[PDB]
Structure 1
Amino acid sequence: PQSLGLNLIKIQCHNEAVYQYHVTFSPSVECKSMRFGMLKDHQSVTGNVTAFDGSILYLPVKLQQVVELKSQRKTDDAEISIKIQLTKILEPCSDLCIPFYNVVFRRVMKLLDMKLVGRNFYDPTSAMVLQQHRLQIWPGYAASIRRTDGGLFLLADVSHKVIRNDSVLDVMHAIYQQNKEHFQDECSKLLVGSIVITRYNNRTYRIDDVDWNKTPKDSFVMSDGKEITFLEYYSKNYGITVKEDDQPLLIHRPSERLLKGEILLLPELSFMTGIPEKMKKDFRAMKDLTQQINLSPKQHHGALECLLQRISQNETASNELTRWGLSLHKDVHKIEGRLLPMERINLRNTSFVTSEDLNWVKEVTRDASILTIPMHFWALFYPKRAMDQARELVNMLEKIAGPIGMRISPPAWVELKDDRIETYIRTIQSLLGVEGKIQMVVCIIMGTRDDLYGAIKKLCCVQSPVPSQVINVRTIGQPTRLRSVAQKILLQMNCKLGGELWGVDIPLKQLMVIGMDVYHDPGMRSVVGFVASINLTLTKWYSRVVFQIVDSLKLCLVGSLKKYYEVNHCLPEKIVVYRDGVSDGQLKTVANYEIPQLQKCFEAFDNYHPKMVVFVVQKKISTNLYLAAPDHFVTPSPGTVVDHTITSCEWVDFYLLAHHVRQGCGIPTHYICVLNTANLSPDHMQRLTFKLCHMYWNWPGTIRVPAPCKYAHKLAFLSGQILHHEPAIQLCGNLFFL
């Protein structure tokens, strides 16, 4: 196993006797802080300890059903009436009590002089300020109380908040200091697209438009029905005095249709959130940023321990915790994971087991691949700017062709007179028109060019179906960084040409491993990519996408079963399904609706009635793991499984760290088995997941997700932004999308 530390962060044991009230303010105050001040002033009637969210409140004592209080606003001496209802009891301290738990612990963070930014709390006393880009990088913790199989935990990981130490108003002031002619247009271009955050209610808004005619001295109407000015609004509610009465106003017109009336924002107390573009190019600034932000497991655990010491040091936060019956542990939680054995990577004439690094970038380019096709009559499309460089590749391509036992002829020498996209398209079309037996088509470009990749995959997956390869000069012009890159280039070449690269021994007989990916960037239509194994060694993968109603994946399953029929000759046995991640709260929509809708598609086939295991694969995980080495906390070894205590209560799931981590702490991947009709054991199912983590052929090593999952992700990525079309059926038997 692995004696890791941390896992889900320390146990936070709680208490009972909560009561849920809905405080109505007449007139309604729109400020959380001043409403909290009124309900702390009224502690004679509402009791010593209150948990207030802004509109919904929690007390440890049962009041009466209707409570009317006469409070005074601390700004204009406005006599307002507080209307305390009595809604819920919340006796058993179930999942219903979790938002109240997060409310009291968020105030526990708040009165430690930690600012609330986004969903997290950050410490300004730990300031790391860069005056070169006038910003502060000040750290904090992303705290949230959750419930898992081990019980009630508080998850907090080290989040660093990039606060530009200059308001949005100060940003336009600085721009006006720089440019005083076209200040408005460039300020609008900078602000639109990246958000601002209002710090009086920590709320983030996208700058849809900026109104320079609108002024805070002008008056607007609330949703309640009162005509008030912005100086008056902020002064009576939030207590903010507007310094400069000539600001613009930021409008955040929301998405779809009151809801979509408008939202108006003041630049004075809204701040920028993003990394400056001047900071990105600066090598020393980014060196400081990624030396102080990618914390080691030692530094991450030390920051969490410093948070624990700060909480135990301040008497007010601890007093709040015990007066609400909460308690934080002395240190973080300690359980043990499990290290899976390394899997033997198989080639033609030999196979090798792997060491702790789980990388085979040098163990591959000594032995021949299991099936490489006789690569002949291929072409190389290059421009003259990479001329000599490109010639070198061809030479070392032969110097790699021998080691991996793959026969390569001198290709076509095709020139690209210009780097235009349609020039590439027409020269590949001319090459395919002249000779119809061209196997592979490879182009070379300058810089990250997404539209060239789009049209190359357009032509080589839709119009004229041929395997293709795209090469960039950002890396290929490096002398010492060339051999290990050309190795992976030739491996991808053999992969997309239909030749089977390295395999892993799959211990399950006659299975159809399926991965799907629902790609929806907004714009473009949502597309489900679908990759299904059609062999016993799982080396060739059938592919198909659909365009969406998401339950109707149409003929994907029956086409996969038809090609498995045509290849394996009337012996289908098993189906293993790997779906993309969905919010918890979309697991039932996946579980009890979509799967016993696609399981009825098997009736189209002649009385099959198969087995089926459906996963939900969740990748972005804010839970961190550190190995508790006898000196300190180090990076966990690849192949680590946490199948308990940090997983969901309702379902069967596990977290797998299946990759080499050199920077910071790794992200384990969450796999939730929503269907297990084939009666897979957890050990066999996660070993199959790790086996497919080995199976990804575009990286000579293991990855965090299974190979069909990343195959479907690349395929749906293609059909979303790179194709906008179903791929041609000729290439669907190959891994053309790598």
Structure 2
Amino acid sequence: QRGSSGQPVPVSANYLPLKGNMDGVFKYAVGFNPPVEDIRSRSQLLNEHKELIGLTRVFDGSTLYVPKRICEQRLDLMSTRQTDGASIKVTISLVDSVKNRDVVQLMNVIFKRILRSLKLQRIGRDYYDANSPLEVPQHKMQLWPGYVTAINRHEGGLMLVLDVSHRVMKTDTALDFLYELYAFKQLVGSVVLTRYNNRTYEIDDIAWDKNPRCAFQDHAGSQITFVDYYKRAYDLDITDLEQPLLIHRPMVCLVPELCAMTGLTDAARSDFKVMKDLAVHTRVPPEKRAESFRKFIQRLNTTKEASELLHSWGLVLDSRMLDMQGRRLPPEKILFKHSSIVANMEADWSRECLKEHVISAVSLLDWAVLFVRKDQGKATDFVNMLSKVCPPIGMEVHEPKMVEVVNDRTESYLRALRELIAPRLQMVVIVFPTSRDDRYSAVKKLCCIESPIPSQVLIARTITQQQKLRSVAQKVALQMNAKLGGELWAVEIPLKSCMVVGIDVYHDKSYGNKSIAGFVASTNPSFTRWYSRTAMQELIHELKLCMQAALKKYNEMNQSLPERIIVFRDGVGEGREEYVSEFEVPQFNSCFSIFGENYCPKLAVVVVQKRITTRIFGRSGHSYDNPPPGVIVDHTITKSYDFYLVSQHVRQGTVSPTYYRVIYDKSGLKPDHLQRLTYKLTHMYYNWPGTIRTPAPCKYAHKLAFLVGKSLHRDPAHELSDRLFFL
């Protein structure tokens, strides 16, 4: 159940083993007979009685945890001492000491209280400070240091995972952002925080119907206005008598004039200046992240309340992150038509791809170019450069059919497109003056669904003379050759008569929560051509037909049927992993089996997760740095047949590994032959020459899902299923 083929590397991970003083805590169950009545009463009486008997604890309704046995193991109190004056029969019953399963929740509560002791606020699911900000003053911004803490049971033991996060908050006030707007979707996700009390509330509604003159209830129903209360409490005022307000449901009202938005808005997401200004702060190298880790753990063991609480619960934690032994997979041989290039440590061959011929090239006897009269010169020079650069890379290209669209609007483009495309024509390229998503969507709708024509769209800006021409032509020629059903490079995959399948779902709130599911399955021994389908429903029953159709395509192409079927599942949360095993695997097992006669394929189902809080650093001596791409971590953190792989190379900052969780293995593949396989599949992406994060079938499936949900909104035509039209 463990990999075995790879040279070991020294690595480390942001984890803290917690000492095993677990057995001490004893559990008491509480019982209340006559009134019951909720917590206010439960807290009061339990407080008094159990405090005389003992101190500390957690009591969530019925269960109660205390480190020591109560002075009486069974104790009965008979007085509610409430306003009514009735009686309550308190029944304390000691049960075992603590279950192995139940310790995790207890230490979770304890550590969240510990972190609250340090003055750190809890925003989102994260713990951020509010008195030590890194500040970028250009665009009214800064960063708040943050710690992403979680106590969970991993195979190594009861482990606290720590991770340094940063949360952008704007010095500008919500009133100024509203003035800029003069946006229901944007604010609801953001957790807007108040400035006067430095308290944080997730926002739900943005209501301008209400007015500040309306006064909220307080002091037993007395109506007091917001401005008077804020002046009395926090010593500030609201300048605007009439203003929009924000609503959060626990009736909580937030005033924009004192509210500063956290997070970065969609306009800020698009604006490149904001991203590049933030990146130097938010993106942290590995050495500074290690230094922040050791500063945090030094801070935790020095403050008074935190130091006392840990010894009160009798747990002492290590003083440094965990060290471990990952293994580096050998670099793989990337195979071009007439030469082979072994990728460097950076795992990039973008320069080399320019100078070598593609494996199999669809000779461009004819292709078309649409353009506007303004960019006619741009189109001509681009076509000339493209014709110049193609013969070096093996493709053979002829001069196009050039059509000048009457107007830049998409409708004229469509009117030309219907007449232009023919069964003979292999591809159409399009010139665009402005980058607008609707025009791209209409073009891709015609090209993918309504008519079977692969196509490429180019906005004018990237082709505005200078040295843009060579780079853009060389990075568009390969994309065109990939869209024409031709392969650029290859790697040697030992697996024979295997059909790797990649499933990833793109949750789109806009399109009625359709949960667009991708489905990409190889149809070649060399894993260079693919069959693409997409399943959508309001997945359960469309995956059936997608899988049967893919099996039929493989049978049509290879005159056989596969013995192995490897399924990589993405887009599923950590909680819902068991749901997939319960409901999806048996359905697949029966569904392809029933069609045909006595056909039983193996179905290896592996779940892939990108968003994780685990970090793997490397060292050689004392300095902490990023590990080279291609390192596996399979032991001491992995639980029940999983592993971690680093495959991406980052120019600035640290690497985020990828989690792989084998939820159902019946294929007979070794864990090592699956690890190496999913590493080799990482180089199979034809848009980026080099490695990526997620395996190539899953990345293709994610792009297919994104294209179908964001742009096409329907099923791409079955004619283009064989071609990677979505690249």
Same structural fold, with TM-score higher than 0.5 when normalized by the shorter chain: yes
- The alpha-carbon distance between structure 1 residues 603 and 124, as it changes in their structure 2 partners (threshold 3 A), is same
User: 3-state SS of the aligned residue for 2:13?
Assistant: coil
AA aligned opposite 1:265: C
The aligned counterpart of 2:445 is 458
Distance in 2 (alpha carbons) for counterparts of 1:379 and 1:41: 84
From 287, 291, 295, the counterpart of 1:306: 295
The equivalences for 1:475-554 within 5 A come to: 475-477=462-464, 479-524=466-511, 525-548=514-537, 550-552=539-541, 553-554=543-544
The equivalences for 1:124-523 within 5 A come to: 124-130=130-136, 133-165=139-171, 171-172=174-175, 186=182, 194-197=190-193, 202-213=200-211, 217-219=215-217, 228=221, 249-252=245-248, 263-267=251-255, 271-275=260-264, 287-432=276-421, 435-477=422-464, 479-523=466-510
- The alpha-carbon distance between structure 1 residues 102 and 405, as it changes in their structure 2 partners (threshold 3 A), is same
AA aligned opposite 2:480: M
- The alpha-carbon distance between structure 1 residues 61 and 566, as it changes in their structure 2 partners (threshold 3 A), is same
The aligned counterpart of 2:558 is 568
Query: Residue 621 in 1 paired to residue 612 in 2?
Result: yes
Give the CA deviation at 1:249: 4.6
Query: Residue 603 in 1 paired to residue 585 in 2?
Result: no
User: 3-state SS of the aligned residue for 1:124?
Assistant: coil
The aligned counterpart of 1:258 is none
Distance in 1 (alpha carbons) for counterparts of 2:464 and 2:479: 19
Give the CA deviation at 1:342: 1.4
The aligned counterpart of 1:49 is 56
Give the CA deviation at 1:90: 7.8
Distance in 1 (alpha carbons) for counterparts of 2:248 and 2:344: 53
Query: Residue 13 in 1 paired to residue 19 in 2?
Result: yes
**C-alpha contact 1:635 1:666 (8 A) present in aligned 2:** yes
User: 3-state SS of the aligned residue for 2:325?
Assistant: coil
From 582, 594, 597, the counterpart of 1:592: 582
The aligned counterpart of 1:725 is 714
**C-alpha contact 1:193 1:207 (8 A) present in aligned 2:** no
Distance in 1 (alpha carbons) for counterparts of 2:465 and 2:81: 72
AA aligned opposite 1:480: Q
The aligned counterpart of 2:686 is 697
User: 3-state SS of the aligned residue for 2:291?
Assistant: helix
The aligned counterpart of 1:580 is 570
Distance in 2 (alpha carbons) for counterparts of 1:386 and 1:13: 69
**C-alpha contact 1:14 1:325 (8 A) present in aligned 2:** no
Distance in 2 (alpha carbons) for counterparts of 1:529 and 1:189: 26
Query: Is the deviation greater in 683-692 or in 580-589?
Result: 580-589
- The alpha-carbon distance between structure 1 residues 175 and 583, as it changes in their structure 2 partners (threshold 3 A), is closer
**C-alpha contact 2:681 2:695 (8 A) present in aligned 1:** yes
AA aligned opposite 1:118: G
The aligned counterpart of 2:3 is none
- The alpha-carbon distance between structure 1 residues 677 and 385, as it changes in their structure 2 partners (threshold 3 A), is same
Distance in 1 (alpha carbons) for counterparts of 2:597 and 2:268: 63
Identify unmatched segments of 5+ residues in structure 2: 1-6
Distance in 2 (alpha carbons) for counterparts of 1:67 and 1:624: 51
Provide, for residues 364-406 of structure 1, a one-character-per-residue CA deviation record: whole Å limited to 9, x for no partner.
Answer: 1212111101112101122344333332222221232111110
User: 3-state SS of the aligned residue for 2:718?
Assistant: coil
**C-alpha contact 2:167 2:263 (8 A) present in aligned 1:** no
AA aligned opposite 1:505: E
Count of aligned pairs between the two proteins: 701
**C-alpha contact 2:523 2:557 (8 A) present in aligned 1:** yes
- The alpha-carbon distance between structure 1 residues 275 and 85, as it changes in their structure 2 partners (threshold 3 A), is farther
AA aligned opposite 1:146: N
**C-alpha contact 2:206 2:244 (8 A) present in aligned 1:** no
From 606, 626, 642, the counterpart of 2:633: 642
Query: Is the deviation greater in 42-51 or in 661-670?
Result: 42-51
AA aligned opposite 2:174: V
Give the CA deviation at 1:314: 1.5
Normalised by the length of structure 1, the TM-score is 0.85
Normalised by the length of structure 2, the TM-score is 0.86
**C-alpha contact 2:18 2:157 (8 A) present in aligned 1:** no
- The alpha-carbon distance between structure 1 residues 99 and 377, as it changes in their structure 2 partners (threshold 3 A), is same
Provide, for residues 268-322 of structure 1, a one-character-per-residue CA deviation record: whole Å limited to 9, x for no partner.
Answer: 8764213378977998875553212211000001100000111122132121112
**C-alpha contact 2:11 2:326 (8 A) present in aligned 1:** no
Distance in 1 (alpha carbons) for counterparts of 2:635 and 2:625: 21
Distance in 1 (alpha carbons) for counterparts of 2:99 and 2:454: 59
AA aligned opposite 1:585: G
Provide, for residues 456-512 of structure 1, a one-character-per-residue CA deviation record: whole Å limited to 9, x for no partner.
Answer: 111011111110111233433363344333222111100111112211111111101
AA aligned opposite 2:166: H
Give the CA deviation at 1:93: 5.1
AA aligned opposite 2:451: S
AA aligned opposite 1:687: R
Distance in 1 (alpha carbons) for counterparts of 2:210 and 2:589: 58
Query: Residue 101 in 1 paired to residue 89 in 2?
Result: no
Distance in 1 (alpha carbons) for counterparts of 2:719 and 2:330: 38
How well do the aligned residues superpose, as a CA RMSD in angstroms? Answer: 4.0
Query: Is the deviation greater in 692-701 or in 83-92?
Result: 83-92
Identify unmatched segments of 5+ residues in structure 1: 221-225, 254-261
- The alpha-carbon distance between structure 1 residues 446 and 274, as it changes in their structure 2 partners (threshold 3 A), is farther
**C-alpha contact 1:36 1:54 (8 A) present in aligned 2:** no
**C-alpha contact 1:217 1:231 (8 A) present in aligned 2:** yes
User: 3-state SS of the aligned residue for 2:152?
Assistant: strand
Distance in 2 (alpha carbons) for counterparts of 1:230 and 1:372: 77
Distance in 2 (alpha carbons) for counterparts of 1:698 and 1:362: 14
**C-alpha contact 1:4 1:337 (8 A) present in aligned 2:** yes
- The alpha-carbon distance between structure 1 residues 319 and 605, as it changes in their structure 2 partners (threshold 3 A), is same
Distance in 2 (alpha carbons) for counterparts of 1:278 and 1:455: 24
User: 3-state SS of the aligned residue for 2:290?
Assistant: helix
**C-alpha contact 1:344 1:352 (8 A) present in aligned 2:** yes
**C-alpha contact 2:206 2:245 (8 A) present in aligned 1:** no
- The alpha-carbon distance between structure 1 residues 479 and 242, as it changes in their structure 2 partners (threshold 3 A), is same
Give the CA deviation at 1:689: 0.6
